[PDB]
């Protein structure tokens, strides 16, 4: 989306250990994190992107808004790769990042990859959905990590956040096996996704 | 005024003095350069003939080139005016009280 | 007429007093530079809330002795923490000499006058101070037009009129042809005490 | 032990993270452990003291790593029948479980 | 031909050079990270020196008190200074060389006793020295010099035990050319004394 | 002959080589991410240095005082418990910051003796007894190094080599000419043979006999040929009434000779 | 690494700065002022020489959410070495007076700028204690007795 700031979440997990894209899902995610960053810059050049960890109980800020690809790239290697995603904590820590920004003319976007299903209670994300859309924050969930064998708990959360205002949630369905992850991003909306009026 | 009066006791060239000492050796730097072969970290310094003056309280200082004359005019054994505390040649003074004395 | 041209009561907070002494005493035998950040209110009241030290300069105190890279960056950091205030003056030391402005320091005051025309210049000796009341005086320029036509004094109205002064030397010569001195007033609460 | 020493020459570089040296120390507790049962107690002792050294220069030491170390140390003491030396070592094993 | 792996291989040939090139570069770039590091530390060490600042030397002229010393500054005037927590008063004594912070004029640390440049030239002399054992001959004479000199320096323990006074002083005299210098040069190595 | 071509069809199977190739495309993707990572790191790191450099450039700038290094005293790292100082601080190992290890003591031309923390800018190997040094005017820190100046006393004594006079032009006295060649040139040129053998090259040759027998002409010829400097020293001068002054120039001439060595 | 923090000397600059800094963010009602403290560390005596604010948020809904700006800590380091190289990050003040368990996790963050364990300097700005205007604690990791786990 044009005129948007985005907090990437790299999923650090033991389902990211598991290989379902080359070399493993972690090495797949380096390539897809580079993809989105540049695509979004071209479409609007004021766009600027941070990175935070999906690891442990606490997500840590690896990068703040920046348009050097090198600062975001560096954090992908540095972070510990074995962890667990915690969606609830992520939404809130991502939201703080979207608070503290160069100009709030931009849309508040969270793009969050899923390799590992939720490790938290369902209902907490339902309550948090209404707080997110209250400040006009949307959350894009890339799902290849809950359709392996998992039933999709993701869909109901996207329903709750979605409501046209200026920002609308999307659910990027990505096939679960090798095809290269970056390409799956590309075939899903990622330069034509938008918030609706 | 006041320019405290000093006098040149040495012509030490500016590219032979080795002001830079990170990659330069004391004997000379290049003899016409000192840090013009370094532009990898951005530091600039060349100058030609910086002189060592001797103050009349007998303190020695490396001082500037002329800032109101060309350095050609400033020589070995020539008196010079330098600032109160910024010690940098502004105006040269004649080389001593020698005229008129000699001519008689 | 025009400007009030009466010399400010400078209210230096406790934090700002101790901070100045800290940077000055480490740096002896050398000069130190720095910018004073506060709020100006009334027509003669400046409250110097905080300070920041400008790194040690290789040419000493002068009109080049603020680098615009440090300055901009430093104020930018105060803006991210809400500690932001406006440059209302500048401080500099003479490390071995009592309070006065040399030719260079007055010329620096002419530059700070441009930016804020109520600006203060504070001269801190770090080592001569054993009380810590002493050898800290603030100066502020009185208009040039004021000097010529002899409308120079106008600092004795709208103050206490208790003055504290000593020395002829440079101090006094500085005073006659340029600036006016007034004591440093210390502000505190009972939480700092 | 060969696999992991080999592995970190490549892996650390490509991956850019992850240390596999944690696991070396359990293997090492187990080499002493083999020595204990075979009745070469003397050999096992030296390898446990060389293990201990590595532990101290680690910033974070997970509980599992030091748990095995103490298990081994416990076995050593009861062969001598030093009741006191076994008792004090076993409490730490129990706590760090 | 009939193969499409024959068509594939042409392309695969181009690829080959690419791996080699990338490997060359990776190895260079790590070495570069290290090289810039050393340069960076050293630039930063100048800056630690600018904030550390010089110090003043004097000498303890006379002890006034444990916590007060008469020092005579090199700059000029005699001073009464304080003693820092850091310098111990066991180190302080009269006539020892001292150094002090410029700031508060408080004794920072003591100095070792400095040497005038005349006597430095004498000390500095070393030719890389010689053996015992390249002074050969007049064996018995070499042995006795060792008996006076070397024997109480290494072992004063035997001399204290017996309760005899340490033996000290030797005078050497002989013809020119006999190697008093050669022996002077030799004895100095053997024992290792300054 | 290489790899990934028709040579390899014979070494390794057509299916197996082709599937190697696909594997080796993956390896590029991994190489690119690593390579860029190392690249962006150098670039970033480079900027930090430029920042520092500029800070030092202001200090390096004129004026600055001139001092001379009396001696160097570099203290040991860990002289104390954890300090390169000779006093206690509870830790920190530094050479010019919290703890002073290396130091140079300089004597100013302002008549002061000052103990300085060594500055990282210069080498401890340049800093000798009487190295002329630039020192920062304000706070005193060794800023830079300067060549040594030499007095008029130094000048007379030293190098007054004129190109070879040539022995053809010093007529007669065949034997004297024969002796000088043997004494000087043969060791200087054939030093390698003297070295392998371990014998010493002549300490002196005494020349004696009445004035005007050519001797001057000859040493001046020999010195240019042998590529040693010509020093001019005359003993009747060095006899003085002042004990100090008279002793001084012997000591000066010995130190300067060894310096300007090889020298005649 | 060292476990050396046995004595903590405080300059009075630190206690009045923490008093100001709370009020320059305007944190209240168990919101906190989290900033850095600089000084010397890796040593038996710690001298807490200086203090600065950092950008920081504190959420009352869950204590495992707070904000911190990392880029601020990296940029403040460059600047402070120029003023004084004897100043380095030695840990963090926290307004308190209540010490919490989530503060262990903030602690971990600060362990990536200083080699030693970070010092968490509780400075009460509310002035409820008539003594202790400084209490100091350091996070250490040890097997706790009585069948208890390894606790941080
Ligand atoms: N063998 C010679 N052939 C030519 N002229 C000579 C010869 N020896 C001496 N002279 C002349 O006499 C001068 C004095 O001799 P010089 O080499 O200076 O001697 P000494 O060291 O013996 O006092 C020479 O400058 C030269 O004019
Ligand atoms: Mg002799
Ligand atoms: Mg002659």
UniProtKB/Swiss-Prot annotation, chain A:
Portion held of the full protein: 1 to 197 of 268
Highest taxon in the source lineage: Eukaryota
Family statement: Belongs to the proteasome subunit S5A family.
Organism, as annotated: Saccharomyces cerevisiae (strain ATCC 204508 / S288c) (Baker's yeast)
Keyword Ubl conjugation carried by entry: yes
Note: Present with 17200 molecules/cell in log phase SD medium.
Protein name: 26S proteasome regulatory subunit RPN10
The keyword Oxidoreductase belongs to this UniProt entry's keyword annotation: no
GO cellular component terms given for this protein: cytosol; nucleus; proteasome complex; proteasome regulatory particle, base subcomplex
Keywords (A to Z) from UniProt: Proteasome, Ubl conjugation
GO annotation terms (biological process): proteasome assembly; proteasome-mediated ubiquitin-dependent protein catabolic process; ubiquitin-dependent protein catabolic process
Post-translational modification, as annotated: Ubiquitinated, leading to its degradation. Ubiquitination is promoted by HUL5.
Biological role: Multiubiquitin binding protein.
Observed effect of gene inactivation: Cells are viable.
UniProt-recorded Gene Ontology molecular function terms: K48-linked polyubiquitin modification-dependent protein binding; polyubiquitin modification-dependent protein binding
Record's subunit section: The 26S proteasome is composed of a core protease, known as the 20S proteasome, capped at one or both ends by the 19S regulatory complex (RC). The RC is composed of at least 18 different subunits in two subcomplexes, the base and the lid, which form the portions proximal and distal to the 20S proteolytic core, respectively.
Stretches assigned to the VWFA domain: 5-190
Curated annotation (Swiss-Prot), chain E:
Description of post-translational modifications: N-acetylated by NAT1.
Positions of ATP binding: 174-181
Protein name: 26S proteasome subunit RPT4
Organism: Saccharomyces cerevisiae (strain ATCC 204508 / S288c)
Superkingdom of the organism of origin: Eukaryota
Positions of disulphide bridges: none
Family: Belongs to the AAA ATPase family.
Function: The 26S proteasome is involved in the ATP-dependent degradation of ubiquitinated proteins. The regulatory (or ATPase) complex confers ATP dependency and substrate specificity to the 26S complex.
Upper classification of the organism: Eukaryota, Fungi, Dikarya, Ascomycota, Saccharomycotina
From Swiss-Prot, chain F:
Keyword terms of this UniProt record: Acetylation, ATP-binding, Cytoplasm, Nucleotide-binding, Nucleus, Phosphoprotein, Proteasome
Any single GO CC term annotated in Swiss-Prot or TrEMBL for this entry: proteasome regulatory particle, base subcomplex
Cystine bridges: none
Modified residue annotations for Phosphotyrosine: 167
A GO MF term: ATP hydrolysis activity
Changes after translation: N-acetylated by NAT1.
Residue numbers binding ATP: 209-216
Protein location: Cytoplasm; Nucleus
One GO term (biological process): proteasome regulatory particle assembly
Family of this protein: Belongs to the AAA ATPase family.
Role summary: The 26S proteasome is involved in the ATP-dependent degradation of ubiquitinated proteins. The regulatory (or ATPase) complex confers ATP dependency and substrate specificity to the 26S complex.
Record protein name field: 26S proteasome regulatory subunit 6A
Shown stretch of the complete protein: 14 to 277 of 434
Curated annotation (Swiss-Prot), chain G:
Tree of life domain: Eukaryota
Modified residues (N-acetylserine): 2
Record's comment on post-translational modification: N-acetylated by NAT1.
Occurrences of domain MPN (ranges): 8-143
Function recorded in the entry: Acts as a regulatory subunit of the 26S proteasome which is involved in the ATP-dependent degradation of ubiquitinated proteins.
Note in the entry: Present with 19800 molecules/cell in log phase SD medium.
Stated family: Belongs to the peptidase M67A family.
Name of this protein: 26S proteasome regulatory subunit RPN8
Organism: Saccharomyces cerevisiae (strain ATCC 204508 / S288c)
Phylogenetic lineage: Eukaryota, Fungi, Dikarya, Ascomycota, Saccharomycotina
Entire protein: shown range: 1 to 152 of 338
């Amino acid at each position: 989306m044009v005129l948007e700031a985005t907090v990437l979440v790299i999923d650090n997990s033991e389902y990211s250990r598991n290989g379902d894209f080359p070399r493993t899902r972690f090495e797949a995610q380096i390539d897809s994190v580079e993809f989105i960053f540049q695509a979004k810059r071209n479409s609007n050049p004021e766009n600027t992107v941070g990175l935070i960890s999906g690891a442990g109980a606490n997500p840590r800020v690896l990068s703040t808004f920046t348009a050097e690809f090198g600062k975001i790239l560096a954090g992908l290697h540095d972070t510990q790769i074995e962890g667990k995603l915690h969606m609830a904590t992520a939404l809130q820590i991502a939201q703080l990042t979207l608070k503290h920004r160069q100009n709030k003319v931009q849309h508040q976007r969270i793009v969050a990859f899923v390799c590992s299903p939720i490790s938290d209670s369902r209902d907490e994300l339902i309550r948090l959905a209404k707080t997110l859309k209250k400040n006009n924050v949307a959350v894009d969930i890339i799902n290849f990590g809950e359709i392996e064998q998992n039933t999709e708990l993701l869909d109901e959360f996207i329903a709750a956040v979605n409501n046209p205002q200026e920002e609308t949630s999307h659910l990027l369905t990505v096939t679960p096996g090798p095809r290269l992850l970056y390409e799956n991003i590309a075939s899903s909306p990622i330069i034509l996704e938008e918030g609706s009026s | 005024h006041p320019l405290q009066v000093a006098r040149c006791t040495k012509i030490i060239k500016g590219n032979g003095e080795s002001d830079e000492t990170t990659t330069d050796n004391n004997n000379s730097g290049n003899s016409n350069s000192n840090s013009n072969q370094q532009s990898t970290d951005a530091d600039e310094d060349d100058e030609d003939a910086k002189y060592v003056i001797n103050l009349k309280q007998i303190a020695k200082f490396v001082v500037g080139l002329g800032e109101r004359v060309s350095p050609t005019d400033i020589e070995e054994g020539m008196r010079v005016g330098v600032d109160r505390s910024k010690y940098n040649i502004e105006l040269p003074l004649p080389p001593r009280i020698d005229p008129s004395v000699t001519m008689m | 007429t025009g400007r009030d041209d009466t010399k400010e009561t400078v209210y230096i907070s406790s934090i700002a007093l101790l901070k100045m002494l800290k940077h000055g005493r480490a740096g002896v035998p050398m000069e130190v530079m720095g910018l004073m950040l506060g709020e100006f209110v009334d027509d003669y009241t400046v409250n110097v809330v905080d300070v920041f030290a400008m790194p040690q300069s290789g040419t000493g105190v002068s009109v080049e002795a603020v680098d615009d890279v440090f300055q901009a960056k430093m104020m930018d950091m105060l803006k991210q923490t809400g500690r932001d205030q406006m440059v209302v003056g500048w401080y500099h030391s003479h490390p071995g000499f009592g309070c006065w402005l040399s030719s260079v320091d007055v010329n620096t005051q002419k530059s700070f006058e441009q930016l804020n025309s109520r600006a203060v210049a504070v001269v801190v000796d770090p080592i001569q101070s054993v009380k810590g009341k002493v050898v800290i005086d603030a100066f502020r320029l009185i208009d040039t037009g004021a000097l010529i036509n002899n409308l120079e004094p106008r600092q004795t109205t709208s103050n206490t009129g208790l003055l504290n002064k000593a020395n002829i030397q440079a101090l006094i010569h500085g005073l006659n042809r340029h600036y006016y001195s007034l004591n440093i007033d210390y502000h505190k609460t009972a939480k700092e005490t | 032990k060969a696999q992991f020493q080999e592995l970190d020459s490549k892996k650390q570089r490509n991956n850019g993270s992850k240390d596999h040296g944690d696991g070396i120390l359990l293997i090492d507790s187990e080499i002493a452990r083999t020595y204990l049962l075979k009745n070469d107690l003397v050999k096992a002792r030296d390898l446990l003291d060389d293990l201990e050294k590595t532990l101290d220069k680690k910033d974070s030491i997970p509980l599992r790593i030091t748990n095995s170390f103490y298990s081994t140390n416990s076995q050593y003491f009861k062969f001598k029948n030093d009741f006191n030396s076994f008792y004090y070592t076993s409490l730490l094993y129990l706590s760090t479980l | 031909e009939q193969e499409a792996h024959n068509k594939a291989l042409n392309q695969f040939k181009r690829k080959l050079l690419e791996h080699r090139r990338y490997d060359d570069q990776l190895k260079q770039r790590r070495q570069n990270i290290r090289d810039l590091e050393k340069l960076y530390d050293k630039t930063e060490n100048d800056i630690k020196a600018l904030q550390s600042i010089g110090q003043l030397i004097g000498e303890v002229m006379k002890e006034l008190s444990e916590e007060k010393y008469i020092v005579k500054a090199s700059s000029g005037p005699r001073y009464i200074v304080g003693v820092r927590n850091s310098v111990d008063r066991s180190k302080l004594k009269k006539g020892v060389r001292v150094t002090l912070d410029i700031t508060t004029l408080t004794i920072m640390r003591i100095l070792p006793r400095e040497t005038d440049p005349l006597v430095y030239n004498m000390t500095s002399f070393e030719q890389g020295e010689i053996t015992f054992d390249g002074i050969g001959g007049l064996t018995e004479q070499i042995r006795e010099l060792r008996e006076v000199i070397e024997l109480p320096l290494k072992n004063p323990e035997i001399f204290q035990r017996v309760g005899i006074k340490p033996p000290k002083g030797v005078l050497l005299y002989g013809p020119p050319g006999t190697g008093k210098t050669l022996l002077a040069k030799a004895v100095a190595a053997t024992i290792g004394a300054n | 002959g290489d790899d990934e071509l028709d040579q390899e069809i014979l070494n390794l199977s057509t299916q197996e080589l082709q599937t190697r190739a696909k594997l080796l495309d993956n390896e590029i993707r991994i190489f690119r991410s690593e390579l860029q990572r190392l690249s962006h790191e150098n670039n970033v790191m480079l900027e930090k240095i430029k920042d520092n450099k500029e800070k030092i450039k202001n200090n390096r700038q004129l004026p600055y005082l001139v001092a001379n290094v009396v001696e160097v005293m570099d203290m040991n790292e860990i002289e104390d418990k954890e300090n390169s100082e000779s006093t206690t601080q509870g830790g920190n190992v530094n050479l010019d910051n919290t703890a002073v290890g290396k130091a140079a003591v300089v004597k100013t031309s302002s008549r002061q003796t000052v103990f300085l923390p060594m500055v990282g800018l210069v080498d401890p190997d340049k800093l000798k007894p009487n190295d002329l040094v630039g020192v920062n005017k304000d706070s005193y820190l060794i800023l830079d190094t300067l060549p040594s100046e030499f007095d008029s006393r130094v000048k007379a004594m030293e190098v007054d080599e004129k190109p070879t006079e040539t022995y053809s032009d010093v007529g007669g006295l065949d034997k004297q000419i024969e002796e000088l060649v043997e004494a000087i040139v043969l060791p200087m040129k054939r030093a390698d043979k003297f070295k392998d053998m371990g014998i010493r090259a002549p300490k002196g040759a005494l020349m004696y006999g009445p004035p005007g027998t050519g001797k001057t002409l000859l040493a001046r010829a020999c010195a240019a040929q042998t590529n040693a400097t010509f020093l001019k020293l005359a003993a009747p001068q060095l006899v003085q009434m002042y004990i100090g002054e008279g002793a001084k120039l012997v000591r000066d001439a010995f130190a300067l000779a060894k310096e300007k060595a090889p020298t005649i | 690494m060292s476990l050396q923090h046995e004595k903590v000397t405080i300059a009075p600059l630190v206690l009045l700065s923490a008093l100001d800094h709370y009020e320059r963010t305007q944190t209240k009602e168990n919101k906190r002022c989290v900033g850095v403290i600089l000084g010397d560390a890796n040593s038996s005596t710690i001298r807490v020489t200086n203090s600065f604010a950092l950008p920081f948020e504190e959420d009352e809904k869950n204590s495992d959410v707070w904000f911190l700006d990392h880029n601020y800590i990296e940029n403040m380091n460059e600047m402070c070495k120029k003023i004084n190289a004897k100043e380095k990050l030695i840990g963090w003040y926290h307004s308190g007076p209540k010490l919490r368990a989530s503060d262990l996790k903030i602690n971990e963050l600060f362990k990536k700028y200083t080699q030693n364990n970070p010092l968490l300097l509780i400075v009460d700005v509310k002035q409820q204690g008539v003594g202790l205007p400084t209490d100091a604690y350091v996070a250490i990791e040890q097997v706790k007795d009585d069948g208890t786990s390894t606790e941080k």
